[PDB]
Amino acid sequence: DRVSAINWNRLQDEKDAEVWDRLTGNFWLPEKVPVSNDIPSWGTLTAGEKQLTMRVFTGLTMLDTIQGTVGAVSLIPDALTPHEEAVLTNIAFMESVHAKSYSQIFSTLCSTAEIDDAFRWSEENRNLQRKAEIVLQYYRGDEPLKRKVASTLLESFLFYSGFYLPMYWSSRAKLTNTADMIRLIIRDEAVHGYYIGYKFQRGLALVDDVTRAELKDYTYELLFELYDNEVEYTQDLYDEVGLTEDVKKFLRYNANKALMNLGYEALFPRDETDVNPAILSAL
Amino acid sequence: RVSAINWNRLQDEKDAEVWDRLTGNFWLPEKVPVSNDIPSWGTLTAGEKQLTMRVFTGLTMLDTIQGTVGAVSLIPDALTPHEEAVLTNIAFMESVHAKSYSQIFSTLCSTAEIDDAFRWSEENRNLQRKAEIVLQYYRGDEPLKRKVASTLLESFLFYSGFYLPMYWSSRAKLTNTADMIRLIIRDEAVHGYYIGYKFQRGLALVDDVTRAELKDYTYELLFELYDNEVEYTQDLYDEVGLTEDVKKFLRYNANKALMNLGYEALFPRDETDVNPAILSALSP
């Protein structure tokens, strides 16, 4: 019903101010990263290596388009404090900045026909469309706690299937400026996943033991459902270049991190998350 | 289903133009040094201080409404995927606007002054009424009426309060606070144009019968919001004797809101001749 003017001089949760300060202090635009210097590096990639990168980037763009246009805004009614709502508007905006930065890279490095083929791929790829349907279903549904689990899994897990590639190129001294751009995105996602997962835990404290158990089951069920689908998405993309086994390690590595954002203990063992150290050095 | 946004093929370059302007004008309240106004602020009457804080709190409510509810409610009615991206920026910048007022309060005012100011916004029938009106259409179903209500908010409802900081600036008082408000007005101007622009494009997709119904709606909603704002204005400005001019400013901005929606101006020039000192404060 009625809305009240936001008073930032009375915070119900100091974390809202902390997250707001970090996110707004990290404000950036794609024009800030000079991707033009990557033109030589880009030309050294195979047609397939170029295609792999453009598709991975288009997949990241969709997750950003979804999270900014639907995800963050759908979290606003489930806020615990009016400042949480303000933080969410920033997330929604920065997601649009993230999605635009990929069109910036495309404009500087790729041709129009290459870009059209990349976007056409995202429309027809069943695995990419499937993971979008899964989170969108919970975003647009009800059950506020389940929505936050799906959102946290998006910020801390779904993205990193594609974040691997720009780190891979950086480890090979290729597309280094683009990697700087993507690093700015990852820095924002970390805070987004931390904040939404933090609020999820705050909401968990307000429900009964039965509901709490139902949600732990839900998180594991949705994680494996999303993971089983992500491995398909990963295989089709990285099997050509032979990176699938390592991307899968990276997937399990961040899946554990996504779980901890939701207050849950890590799930995958060390022997399944030992991603190649060259990729972590790029992080 | 959702498709990844491709900024290299815009169905409307206006989306890219507005995005560039809005993001290029990014600002935060920490950028304006309001502390320099502490001497100026101390020169105001207890009533002048209370008047200024309430007007600011009223603006804070409009921003809280427009950022958390208004802008986001426009996203499903977007014509292009880039329009949606623009709307997220508006939603965020609105939160920045509402935050900047808490910044001014923190530097100039006391805690008891701030609580009393916010308590007023809760009990004031006219402020609550204009919020109820726009929220009704924001949360409703008719998307074209939602855009009309939003434009009237961006181009009309706000300027009832924008008058005061410009008044102080014209009297060499609270000049740094005025600089903050000017940064806010810079964003509002673009918002009203953009949303009104999209309203006009949406008008082209309906039949003449619907278009006629919406023109009737716009004048009827403008009449409701204006009559409510004059009550809001009198109760606030009657003490300092500024009501007659704020009403001039109201008709001045009401015309601007109408034209943003593609409609003809309503008040004649002899009814919108606001004191030039106030108009000079709005411009560099």
Place this chain on the structure above:
Amino acid sequence: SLVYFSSVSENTHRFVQKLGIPATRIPLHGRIEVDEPYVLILPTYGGGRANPAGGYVPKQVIAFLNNDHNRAQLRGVIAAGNTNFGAEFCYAGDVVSRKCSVPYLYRFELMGTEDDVAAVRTGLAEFWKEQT
């Protein structure tokens, strides 16, 4: 002994709990003093400025370490954080380690995996056995 700090999210607090070693917490509000030597476990918090002083150390920790009596008995620092923060990854330990004479013992993310708890227990035990 162990001295740890954790914000309201308590990712670091829950890690120290899994450790099982008795430890004292740096309160979110107010100052405290310690008697026996200790190792410090704190998370890393950038604040929009980024670019790794510059902070990264919780203000409650800065106050606790600004205490001459408390700083003197500090022996080591273990920093928590998240690798998604680029060069800022656990930089709070870099700050505490560099701005003091203590060494940088360990880094872990969020609540830490089962491997982190086993790693800190054995490492901290052999560390205390060294001081002798």
